[PDB]
Curated annotation (Swiss-Prot), chain A:
Binding partners and assembly: Heterodimer with IL10RB.
Protein name per its UniProtKB record: Interferon lambda receptor 1
Lineage of the organism: Eukaryota, Metazoa, Chordata, Craniata, Vertebrata
Segment of the intact protein contained: 250 to 270 of 520
Similarity remark: Belongs to the type II cytokine receptor family.
Gene: IFNLR1
Coiled coil: none
Recorded superkingdom: Eukaryota
Organism: Homo sapiens (Human)
UniProt PTM: Ubiquitinated by FBXO45-containing E3 ligase leading to proteasomal degradation.
UniProtKB/Swiss-Prot annotation, chain B:
Function: Tyrosine kinase of the non-receptor type, involved in the IFN-alpha/beta/gamma signal pathway. Kinase partner for the interleukin (IL)-2 receptor as well as interleukin (IL)-10 receptor. Kinase partner for the type I interferon receptor IFNAR2. In response to interferon-binding to IFNAR1-IFNAR2 heterodimer, phosphorylates and activates its binding partner IFNAR2, creating docking sites for STAT proteins. Directly phosphorylates STAT proteins but also activates STAT signaling through the transactivation of other JAK kinases associated with signaling receptors.
Subcellular compartments: Endomembrane system
Occurrences of domain FERM (ranges): 1-329
Free-text tissue specificity from the UniProt record: Expressed at higher levels in primary colon tumors than in normal colon tissue. The expression level in metastatic colon tumors is comparable to the expression level in normal colon tissue.
Medical condition linked: Autoinflammation, immune dysregulation, and eosinophilia: An autosomal dominant disorder characterized by immune dysregulation, severe atopic dermatitis, and chronic gastrointestinal inflammation. Additional features include asthma, food or environmental allergies, as well as poor overall growth with short stature.
Subunit record text: Interacts with IL31RA. Interacts with IFNGR1. Interacts with JAKMIP1. Interacts with SHB. Interacts (via N-terminus) with IL2RB and IL10RA (via its cytoplasmic domain). Interacts with FER.
Post-translational modification: Autophosphorylated. Phosphorylated by TYK2 on tyrosine residues in response to type-I interferon signaling, leading to its activation. Phosphorylated on tyrosine residues in response to interferon gamma signaling. Ubiquitinated by RNF125; leading to its degradation by the proteasome.
Interval of the full protein contained in this chain: 36 to 558 of 1154
Phosphoserine: residues carrying this PTM: 173
Similarity remark: Belongs to the protein kinase superfamily. Tyr protein kinase family. JAK subfamily.
Record note on domains: The protein kinase 1 domain is also called the pseudokinase domain and has a regulatory role through the transactivation of other JAK kinases associated with signaling receptors. The protein kinase 2 domain is the catalytically active domain.
Full protein name: Tyrosine-protein kinase JAK1
Length: 21, 420
């Protein structure tokens, strides 16, 4: 197993919940 | 032995020894939370331990018992910020929710999300699960940001973390992941919060209302069947004059929603079958734990729940909804008729309605209604006895005071109805 090998260590993308006009 | 509020600064009300009725408590609660008399009907009492709602007419005789005062009758896309969903509004002589009710709904949404009464949707795939967790962090940012805006404090003023503002199941999931992942998540959160509170919040001048609406819409999209109640059953009956389909050998689910009415399905190991929208129901009969819903086309749905209480909860939901979308003055089952409505139509008293409707009702004809501002008087002031504003004689009941002193139309349109 690896400490860094999981979806959270993908490039951070701002969540759609925080999208505004 | 008390009624609880999800609002931040609202002390619960302890109940002394005596007989109570759910409606009066819901009125007290509506008064406590500045809830308008029109929206009072949207709220009900939820029994935390048994997970069963109380019908308005349910009597409470008082032990330890904690009841949650919460908005039960919900309509998806009430906020109208969804393009792929039909709009929801109210008839004018316009929006469903005012600010007061909206605040409470927001508190409720937060409580439900955190305590997992509104569980996150299952992941269609690994990336989708990750994305769900990301959106959870987003929700945390929204909540904390709202709290920030409300207290007039900025990010240096606030101490807190994302851990008490997400579902507990996810938190506990995270606490079992390796240190680096916890660090990673916390940092990414802090970044989201920073960016949102530095740029977005003021770049677009996002108000508090906007954040509430965003949060709740995200709740609609992010959680399982939000604003909906699902009932289990092992014996379901769908029948008509020439059909009799019995489903047996809990394997079947029946869902009640405010903009699709009653639906049912085989509990999965795909899609829901529509039985009826609310306006088509003529009456509902309860026998023991069995509920029998009758439609206008002589079609019938019949189902056997776990007990009588659950049946009461179910029919009370359906009935409330019927009042919300069909007729604001008719009830579908005597077993769950709110004493007020009964005494209302019995004495020929309408509901709080916009004046144009009153003047119109008066023109095309004395119309009796309810105060559009407070619960205390009928537009005559009632107290714990009935009398006029300047009167001094406490007539024991409205009928008596009216004796010594028009009517509502069935399926009549009003702002007490939601157009869906």
């Amino acid at each position: 197993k690896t400490l860094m090998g999981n979806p959270w260590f993908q490039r951070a993308k701002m969540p759609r919940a925080l999208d505004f006009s | 032995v008390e009624v609880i509020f999800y609002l931040s600064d609202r002390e619960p009300l302890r109940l002394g020894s005596g007989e109570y009725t759910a409606e009066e408590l819901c009125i007290r609660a509506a008064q406590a939370c500045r809830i308008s008399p029109l929206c009072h009907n949207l709220f009900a009492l939820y029994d935390e331990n048994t997970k069963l709602w109380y019908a308005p007419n349910r009597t409470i005789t008082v032990m330890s018992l904690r009841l949650h005062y919460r908005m039960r009758f919900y309509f998806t896309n009430w906020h109208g910020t969804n393009d792929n969903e039909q709009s929801v509004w109210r008839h004018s002589p316009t929006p469903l929710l005012d600010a007061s009710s909206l605040e409470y709904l927001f508190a409720q949404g937060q409580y439900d999300l955190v305590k997992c009464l509104a569980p996150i949707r299952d992941p269609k795939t690994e990336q989708d699960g990750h994305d769900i967790e990301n959106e959870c962090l987003g929700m945390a940012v929204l909540a904390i940001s709202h709290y920030a805006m409300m207290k007039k404090m900025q990010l240096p003023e606030l101490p807190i973390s994302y851990k008490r503002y997400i579902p507990e199941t996810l938190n506990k999931s995270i606490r079992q992941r390796n240190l680096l992942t916890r660090m990673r998540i916390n940092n990414v959160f802090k970044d989201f919060l920073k960016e949102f509170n530095n740029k977005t919040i003021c770049d677009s001048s996002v108000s508090t209302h906007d954040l509430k609406v965003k949060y709740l819409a995200t709740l609609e999209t992010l959680t399982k069947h939000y604003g909906a109640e699902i009932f289990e059953t092992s014996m379901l009956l769908i029948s008509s004059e020439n059909e009799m389909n019995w489903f047996h050998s809990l394997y079947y689910e029946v869902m009640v929603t405010g903009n699709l009415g009653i639906q049912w399905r085989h509990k999965p190991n795909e899609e829901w079958n529509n039985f009826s929208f609310f306006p088509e129901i003529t009456h509902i009969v309860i026998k023991e734990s069995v509920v029998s819903i009758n439609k206008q086309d002589n079609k019938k749905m019949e189902l056997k729940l776990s007990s009588h209480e659950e049946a009461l909860s179910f029919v009370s939901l359906v009935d409330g909804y019927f009042r919300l979308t069909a007729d604001a003055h008719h009830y579908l089952c005597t077993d769950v008729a709110p004493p007020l409505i009964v005494h209302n139509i019995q004495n020929g008293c309408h509901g709080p309605i916009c004046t144009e409707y009153a003047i119109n009702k008066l023109r095309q004809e004395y119309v009796l209604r309810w105060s559009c501002t407070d619960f205390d008087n009928i537009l005559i002031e009632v107290q714990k006895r009935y009398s006029l504003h300047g009167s001094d004689r406490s007539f024991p009941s409205l009928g008596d005071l009216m004796s010594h002193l028009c009517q509502p139309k069935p399926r009549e349109i009003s702002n007490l109805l939601v157009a869906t």
